[PDB]
Design a protein around this ligand. Structure first.
Ligand SMILES: Cc1cccc(C)c1OCC(=O)N[C@@H](Cc1ccccc1)[C@@H](O)C[C@H](Cc1ccccc1)NC(=O)[C@H](C(C)C)N1CCCNC1=O
Ligand SMILES: [Cl-]
Ligand SMILES: [Cl-]
Ligand SMILES: [Cl-]
Ligand code: NA
Lengths: 99, 99
């Protein structure tokens, strides 16, 4: 699709069989989702936002659908105020910024 | 241009007679620049996200050139870790997300 930016670029994602709303974010290096259960082992990570850094759980090779596009990759889980699809998965689904 | 997302989508901007590098951020409602002087009136604002909130100065009707494209809008100035071009000015340069 071509998504303009007059409103937030929110899409539906599916992860763990569940539908969630998330933001397509070219300013995010990684994907971070609100607290949920994911399979496997996780690794520690810090990410930085407008107000400072938070600790998150890094899950690798997680199956996730983004606006109907299937992806498999790293998902961070933690106390983010909004679900964010970052560049690691935007790149995988072929997204570019155009002007 | 068409910007892929393997790396951060950083571009050069001109604001307040100064050149800066800034992040094209579809996940940002607002444009936030590191501390600098701008002409005219301003009012305080709090913006919060990952990591919490920061206090900024809101300047309205500020012209910015973004990767050679002129726009005008509100610019927030404060202790952001990164200069961010948000949706309020991305729409004005006709930026879209495409996949
Ligand atoms: C940078 C990065 C590394 C790894 C993983 C992730 C998710 C990363 O991105 C973290 C991050 O906060 N990125 C921001 C920009 C970023 C990159 C690097 C350092 C700091 C910031 C931005 O793009 C998304 C984030 C989303 C958001 C979160 C909570 C509430 C509302 C929105 N947006 C905002 O904070 C904006 C600010 C920028 C005006 N914002 C806050 C006021 C209300 N609305 C709004 O839009
Ligand atoms: Cl990934
Ligand atoms: Cl504006
Ligand atoms: Cl448009
Ligand atoms: Na003004």
């Amino acid at each position: 699709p071509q998504i303009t930016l007059w409103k937030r670029p929110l899409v539906t994602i599916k992860i763990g069989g569940q539908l969630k709303e998330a933001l397509l974010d070219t300013g995010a290096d990684d994907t971070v989702i609100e607290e949920m259960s994911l399979p496997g082992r996780w690794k520690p990570k810090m990410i930085g936002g407008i107000g400072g850094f938070i600790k998150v759980r890094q899950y690798d090779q997680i199956i996730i659908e983004i606006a109907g596009h299937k992806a498999i990759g790293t998902v961070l889980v933690g106390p983010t105020p909004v679900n964010i699809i970052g560049r690691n998965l935007l790149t995988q689904i072929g997204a570019t910024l155009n002007f």
